């Protein structure tokens, strides 16, 4: 079955809620596993404690870099980077979970949660998941974003893990 993970969001201590996602199996057997093992924190590193450094209202919330906390660090479970899995799935609408990168073959640990249809991203970004529930917690992390993506407060992944 297709995995389901979650994040327990906080906003500077004060907990917000939970956002769970349905990773994809048959579509992305190597990309979903990456995000799974990290959502868990399955190796002494993963998204546990990391944050959303770049949030842009109406577009997306970005996070994943547990290393430098800016948009340079992070790393997959295969050292640091890995090829573009495939581009079979497209940025159809809000909740779409997709891999953040720096061009082709640069997938680390960084990802973004779309909060609108981001079609221009298709082909450029590997889509590998979607928010299951808590898309309300996501739409609440936006009141803390900006034009450039700077967090108006401090949105944290107070916890995360796999339920199925």
């Amino acid at each position: 079955v297709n995995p389901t993970v979650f994040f327990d969001i906080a906003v500077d201590g004060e907990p917000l809620g939970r956002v769970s996602f349905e990773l994809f199996a048959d579509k992305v057997p190597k990309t979903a596993e990456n995000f799974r093992a990290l959502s868990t924190g399955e190796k002494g590193f993963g998204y546990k404690g990391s944050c959303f450094h770049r949030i842009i209202p109406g577009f997306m919330c970005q996070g994943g870099d547990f290393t430098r906390h800016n948009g340079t660090g992070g790393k997959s479970i295969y050292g640091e980077k890995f090829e573009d899995e495939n581009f079979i799935l497209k940025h159809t609408g809000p909740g779409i979970l997709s891999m953040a990168n720096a061009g082709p073959n640069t997938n680390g640990s960084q990802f973004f949660i779309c909060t609108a249809k981001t079609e221009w991203l298709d082909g450029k970004h590997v889509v590998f998941g979607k928010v299951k529930e808590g898309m309300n917690i996501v739409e609440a992390m936006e009141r803390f974003g900006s034009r450039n993506g700077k967090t108006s407060k401090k949105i944290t992944i107070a916890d995360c893990g796999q339920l199925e």
Partner: peptide
């Protein structure tokens, strides 16, 4: 620097 643009 990593990240999608608007």
């Amino acid at each position: 620097h990593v990240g999608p643009i608007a």
